[PDB]
Amino acid sequence: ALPSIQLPVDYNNLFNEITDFLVTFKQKGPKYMAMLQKVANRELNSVIIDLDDILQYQNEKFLQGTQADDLVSAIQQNANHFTELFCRAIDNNMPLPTKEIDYKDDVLDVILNQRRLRNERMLTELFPPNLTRRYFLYFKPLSQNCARRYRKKAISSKPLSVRQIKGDFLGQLITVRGIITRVSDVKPAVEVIAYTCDQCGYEVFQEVNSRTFTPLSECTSEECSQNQTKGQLFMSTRASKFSAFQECKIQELSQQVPVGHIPRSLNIHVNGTLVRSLSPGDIVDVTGIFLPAPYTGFKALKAGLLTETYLEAQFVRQHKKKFASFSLTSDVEERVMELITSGDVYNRLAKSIAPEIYGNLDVKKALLLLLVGGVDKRVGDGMKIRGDINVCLMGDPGVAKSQLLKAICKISPRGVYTTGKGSSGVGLTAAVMKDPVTDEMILEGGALVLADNGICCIDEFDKMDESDRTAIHEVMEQQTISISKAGINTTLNARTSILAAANPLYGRYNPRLSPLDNINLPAALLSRFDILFLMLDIPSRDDDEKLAEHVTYVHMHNKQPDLDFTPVEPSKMREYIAYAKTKRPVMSEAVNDYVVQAYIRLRQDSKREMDSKFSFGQATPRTLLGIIRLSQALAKLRLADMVDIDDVEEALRLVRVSKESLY
Amino acid sequence: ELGTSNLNLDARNLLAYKQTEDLYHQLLNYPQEVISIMDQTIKDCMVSLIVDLDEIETKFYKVRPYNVGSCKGMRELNPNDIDKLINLKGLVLRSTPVIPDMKVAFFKCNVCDHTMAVEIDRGVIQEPARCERIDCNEPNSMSLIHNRCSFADKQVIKLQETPDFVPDGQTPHSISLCVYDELVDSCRAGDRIEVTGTFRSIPIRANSRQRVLKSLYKTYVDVVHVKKVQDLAKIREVAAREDLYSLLARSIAPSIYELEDVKKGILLQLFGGTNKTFTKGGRYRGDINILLCGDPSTSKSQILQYVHKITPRGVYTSGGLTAYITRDVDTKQLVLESGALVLSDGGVCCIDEFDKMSDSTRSVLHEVMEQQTISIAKAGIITTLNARSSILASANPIGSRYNPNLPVTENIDLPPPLLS
C-alpha cells in the first residue's frame, strides 16, 4: 500500500514541552496564563504567540542538561500541525472565568444547553472543539537581534521578494515584502455546519476545511436508523460556525525587478480578527504560511501534477507612514510653539518647498496661498462659495514648472497628478468600472479622481481631448459632476483646487498680442481661473550665471547642498499647513469699502483694456471674488480670527505681479 | 374604521417601558417568531376590542418595526450580526421584475382527473408518490398544473451605501435586498431610503449539475419597513392684491440685482399661454421660448438653475437630447429610450452653452419648435413622440466682449432662421 520511513521527529515530547512552556513560562506571574484568564472572561478574542520567548526559554533551560531537542526548528519546517497542537494545549489548560459574563447573549451556548438538557436527560455527545472556540491563534516572526544573542542561525524573517519564492518553501513560515494592490470585501466562511432533523435528539455536526464540500441528507439517529427517517433534515444557519474571510494579492516592487522583466503577483488569504488590517496602495512586511492549492477548483482535468500556491497571513506590519489627521500631542504642540517663536513663516516656507529649482519666489508664494484655501463655508441664503483657488501656470518649455508641480504633489497629501494622454481611465469613469470578477458593472457615473478636497495637478493643459476638457469645465466652481449613462445619478461632490501647467502652441513667447496667441483655450475657462502667472525665458547674464552655478553645485555634491538655507522641513510644512487650515479665521467687515474701491480701480483698468497689446485686464466679478478669496487665505495662513487690510494689499500686489509678466 | 392593515411600531417608545425591553432584546435575537406572535396577538386584539367580525377574518395583520438600533454601514458587517435586525440607509440603484414565488402546489391525477392541493415548506416539495384515489391507486399518475397554483410576489433591490461612508476616495459597495407584497415597487432608481430588516446568508449552488456547495456564502438582507430619507382660499387672498405681479416676479431671483424686465419675461414664460386643438385648422402652439445672450459676467446660468427647480417638470442640460435606441447594459436586450426634450412635456426645458450645439442636433430643434412632435425611423421602429415643451437658452458672444456696434447675428453664430 504505502511504504513507511523513519523520521527523527516525535510529537509526544513536543506536546509535553509545549504544555510545560505554556504553564511554567516566566517573562504579573506567567504571561500566558495572564492572557488565558482574560480570554476566559470573553475579553480577548484572538491569541498571538511569539517564538522569541520559546527560543530564549529553551536556551536558558538548556543550562540544565535535561532538554534534548528544540522547537523553533520544527516550527519553521512545518506550521499547521503546530497550530493544532497549540489549540489542543490551550483547550486542555483553559482557566476558569474570574469575572461575571453577560451569559444570556451567547445564543450558541443556549442552543448547546437545550441540546444537552434534551439528550443527557435521557442518557450526550462530545462536541468538536472547533465549534466552541472563541479565540483565534496567531504566530509572530522573530527579531534578528534575538538571533544575534545566540550562535545558532534561528533567522527566518529576511523579507524575500515575490519572485524569490521557489517550490522548496512550501509548508514553511516565510516573510514577503511589496505593495498591496487589491483588497476584496469581507465575507463569511464556514467552519462547522449544523443540521436539524425534525426533533432527532442530537443534531448532526460536521466540519469542512476544503474550499468545497457536500451536504448531508439522512441522519444517523436510531429513530432514523430505522428504515425510514423521522423527519427530513435541513441546514441550520444559526447553530453553524463562521469566520471572517478576505482575499488580497501583492505585487513586487519596481526596485526588486531584474532588468527586462515583468513583475509577478502573489495571493494572500486572511482570516480572523486580522481581517481589514491593510488597505490597497501601501508597503507591508507580511509573515505567513506558504501553502499549496489544488487545481481541481478549475475542473479542467489537466495539470495532473501542477498546482497553484497561496499564502495565509499571520502578522502584518503596516509600515509606510501615518497621516494621523494632525491629531494633537505634546510633541506637535511644542513644535507649533517653536513655529510661533520663529516669527515670520511664509517666506521660509516658500524658500523650503523646492530648493532644487532656483529663483521663482512669487510662484512659491502663490503655492503657499493655494495650500491654505480661500473663503468657504457658504454665506446667508445658502449661496455657494468655495475656498478652492484655481491658478494656471504658463511659460516656455524648459522652465521646470513640471518639476515644481511634482514637488508640490509630493508635499501635499491630496495631490493628484495628470498629464497629456497615456491612458483613458483618468477621467469620466470610476476606477471600479467592470472590475469585479463577476462583472457587476460597479460604477458611480459622473466622477473624477478623488475630486472631493483634492488637488488636481495637470501638465500639458492644451493636450487633452474634448472629453477631459468637458469634465474640467464641469468641475467648475465646486459644481458636482452629474453625467449619466445607464440611469445612474449619484453625482460626485466635486470640490477641488485646480493647478495646471500649459505650454504655448508656438513653444515660445510672442511679440504680437497674447490673448490671440493664448493657449488655445476658451476665454470663459481662462476667466474662471483666479490667478494667471507667466514664466518667460529672458536671455541674460546675471540670471543664467546664478542658475548654472546652482545646478552645477547640485550636481557636484550629489545631494541638496548646504548652499540652501531653509529653517523649516517638509514634515514641518505638512504639520503647519494643517495647523493653519484648522484655525480658520473669519471675515472682517471693514475691508468692504477698501475692496469696493479696489474693484472700482480694476474696472477703471477695464476702461483701458481696449488699448490692447495685452487684453487680460478684463471686467469680471470673478476677479473681485478671487481677490476676496486670496485675502481670506492670507488671513487664514496666520494671525487671529480677523482679516487684515494688509492681506488685501498683499493679494492685490500678488495680482499685479501676476499681470505684469505680460509686458 | 379605516379597513387598512398595517401597524407601525417604534422601538424607543417600546423601550420606554421596563417589562417591554425584555421582549425588545428577545426580538433582536429572534425576529421572525416574535413578529409572527405579535401579529397573531393583533389578530386576537381585533375581537378583544370590537367586543363586525366579517372584515376581520378576511384581512391579515403585520407590523413595521423601525428605529431598533443605530444605522450601520456596509463597511462593518461582522458574521456576529447574522439573523439579527439592523437599520440601514442608502441609495436605491436598480430593481428587477417581480418574481412569482411558489406557495400552493397544484396536482392532478391524470388517469382519474383527481386533483389535490399541497402545501409547501422551505421551498422543497414533498411530492405525492401516489394518487389518493385507491380505486385507481396508481403511483405514476401524478402530474402538476403550472397555471392553477397560487403565487407570491418577490422583488429584489440593489442598494448602495451613502457616499458619507467613504472619506478617502474608495469605492462604495452593494448589498442585495428582498421585499414582499406591500413593499413591492415602493422604491425605484435614484431614491434615498432607510430600511430596517434582518440579515441573512445563503449557500451558493456553484455547479448547477452537481451537489457540491462552495465554502463561502452570499450575504443579503430581508427588510420589513422602509422610509424615505384647502389652501386655495389663501391663494385668492394673495391673488387679490394689486402689486402681486412685481413681488411675484422679484420673488424667484432674490440674489439677482436689477434685471427686472427679463425676470418678468421669464415669469410670464413660466406661466405659459393657452393651448387649443380646434380641428378645422389643427392645433396651435401655446409655449413661449426665450433666448439669453451676453458676456459671461452676468451669472446667467444661475437663472436657469433657479427655474429648473422652481418649475414642476423640466430637464436642465447643455450642448443626445432626444430619443435614441440603446443596448441594455446589465441585461442583453433592446429598449426604446427617450431624450431630455421628450420628458419636458408641459414644462420648461433649459439649455446652456447653446453656441456649442454641434450641427446634427440643431436640425432636431428646428423639427421640434415648428411642430412640437418628433418622429424616429430606426431599427425597424417608426413612430412619433410628442414634446410640447418650452425652451429657454443662453449663449455667449465670440471674443472677450460683445461689441455694441457689431450686430447681434455674427457674435451669436446661430443661423438666422433659428434665431428668428
Ligand SMILES: Nc1ncnc2c1ncn2[C@@H]1O[C@H](COP(=O)(O)OP(=O)(O)OP(=O)(O)O)[C@@H](O)[C@H]1O
Ligand atoms: N530654475 C531652475 N532650476 C533648476 N533646474 C532648472 C530650472 N529651470 C529648469 N531646470 C531644469 O530643466 C529641467 C526641467 O524642465 P522641463 O522642460 O522638464 O519642464 P517644463 O518647463 O514643465 O517643460 P516640459 O513640458 O518640456 O517638461 C530639469 O532638468 C531642471 O534641472
Ligand SMILES: Nc1ncnc2c1ncn2[C@@H]1O[C@H](COP(=O)(O)OP(=O)(O)O)[C@@H](O)[C@H]1O
Ligand atoms: N449680477 C450678479 N450677481 C451675482 N453674481 C454675479 C453677477 N454677475 C456675475 N456674477 C458672478 O460671475 C459669474 C458669471 O458667470 P456666467 O455669466 O453665468 O458664466 P456662463 O454663463 O458663461 O457660465 C457667476 O458665477 C457669478 O458668480
Ligand SMILES: [Mg+2]
Ligand atoms: Mg513641462
Ligand SMILES: [Zn+2]
Ligand atoms: Zn429526522
Ligand SMILES: [Zn+2]
Ligand atoms: Zn387517482
